[PDB]
Design a binder for this molecule. Structure first.
Ligand code: XML
Lengths: 251, 251
């Protein structure tokens, strides 16, 4: 009884949690620049993930110890009554690391906490990570960073989403926020509730790839294109259709 | 005039070329095992890509120099009248490398030949790489290799497809061929001509992930699951609908 149109079960009581780790400033001795505009990203994401039924939980400028505690907490709580799990990083990164305030964390140890083995309540449910992280280079200016974070997959039923691929550049407007987040959040607003999520991420790839970078206020920023990507280990179609909440306890 | 259902143009005179580099044996001094069954893979792929309209070109056990010549040839010929380009590697690999017969080749230099800059006739057309490569460990037995090849994205309008992700294992039957290729080729047969290609690759992820590995003829092969993945930098939906060939020159 094999079904080419099989969808993840998205009929649980609650949609699930969306973590957002949001990083604007860094410990002096890391020599990483302010990510001015990351609060636009955090707020835009918070709105769009809320409207899809997520319990959004934001954390600003956590040290490694605090971050590991919050994400481990969330991994060991029960997700039994939840459709899925979303985790977002807005920071600097390098290779297989994201920056917390004070030090780098191995991405594999964060995604590892939600792998079948370690988090039973999320087995066979989609686990989406969205990563807006690049190399800190050193009114509304556009800053540009070199891609730095390996666009790795995680495990079965994960979807890893990346602002930028190897050899491209990642853009953040200091008031409007990151190109990738703006375009992801626009697409979530228009199509979040109708389109399959990889269909949508493909729209985000088109939108971001088509941002022209020929006439730029900085000369050295010209020719630096942005192409995002996603690594899918999903096994079914993923939809965020409106949940029917009429005369039901959903908290 | 922005279209959430935008499809790549697949109405050119010809579908395009599908290269298949097929590697069964290796130079002694590489200490890599025979990939018994890789000819089933090559033949199964050749059939299914043909039936979708591809000019399939297979090459067996090319040395690095020969392989680079054939793939550079194909990159500098015109694809102007073609929908897309498919390239398949069936070999051993490590990190960012595939093995030819005599030495390793950097995957980036092979995908690099088809990037917009270097191959104008393929700009804005999908470029699909399928990679069945793992670590050579050292009638119909199932052999099992550790994942080894980084699941890299390439550039705009590429789709990188991988037999296996980090921490999983890749299976090849010595007569029936690789689990990944069997399941990809089954899905191409049933759904190649109807389904969006990432939709299909998701079916392949389900099919391969669901192959049970609890009761195995080798004890040490038990518990070694296989989960493939794909890295999409595609900007539109990709379909291989039957081409209208009726009273038209398609050669
Ligand atoms: O996907 C894998 C598979 C493995 F067998 C081992 C590690 C990984 C994850 N690492 C990466 N994943 C995506 C793009 C680049 C890299 C990378 C480049 N350099 C180091 N790592």
């Amino acid at each position: 009884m094999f079904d080419p149109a099989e969808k993840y079960k998205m009929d649980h009581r609650r949609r699930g949690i969306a973590l957002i780790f949001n990083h604007e400033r860094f410990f002096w001795h890391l020599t990483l620049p302010e990510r001015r505009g990351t609060c636009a990203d955090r707020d835009n994401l918070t709105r769009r993930f809320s409207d899809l039924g997520f319990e959004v939980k934001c954390f600003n400028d956590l040290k490694a110890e605090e971050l590991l505690l919050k994400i481990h907490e969330v991994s060991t709580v029960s997700h039994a009554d939840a459709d899925c799990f979303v985790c977002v990083f807005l920071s600097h990164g390098e290779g297989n690391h994201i920056y917390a305030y004070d030090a780098k964390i191995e991405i594999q140890t964060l995604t590892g906490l939600f792998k079948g083995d370690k988090c039973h309540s999320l087995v066979g449910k989609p686990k989406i990570f969205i990563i807006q992280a690049a190399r800190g280079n050193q009114t509304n200016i556009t800053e540009v960073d070199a891609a730095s974070v390996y666009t790795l997959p995680a495990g079965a039923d994960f979807l890893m989403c990346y602002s930028v691929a190897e050899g491209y550049y990642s853009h953040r407007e200091t008031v409007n926020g990151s190109w990738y987040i703006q375009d992801l959040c626009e697409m979530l607003g228009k199509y979040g509730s109708s389109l399959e999520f990889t269909e949508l991420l493909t729209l985000v790839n088109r939108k971001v790839s088509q941002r022209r970078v020929d006439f730029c206020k900085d000369p050295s920023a010209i020719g630096k294109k942005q192409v995002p990507c996603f690594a899918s280990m999903l096994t079914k179609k993923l939809h965020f259709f409106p949940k029917s909440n009429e005369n039901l306890y959903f908290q």
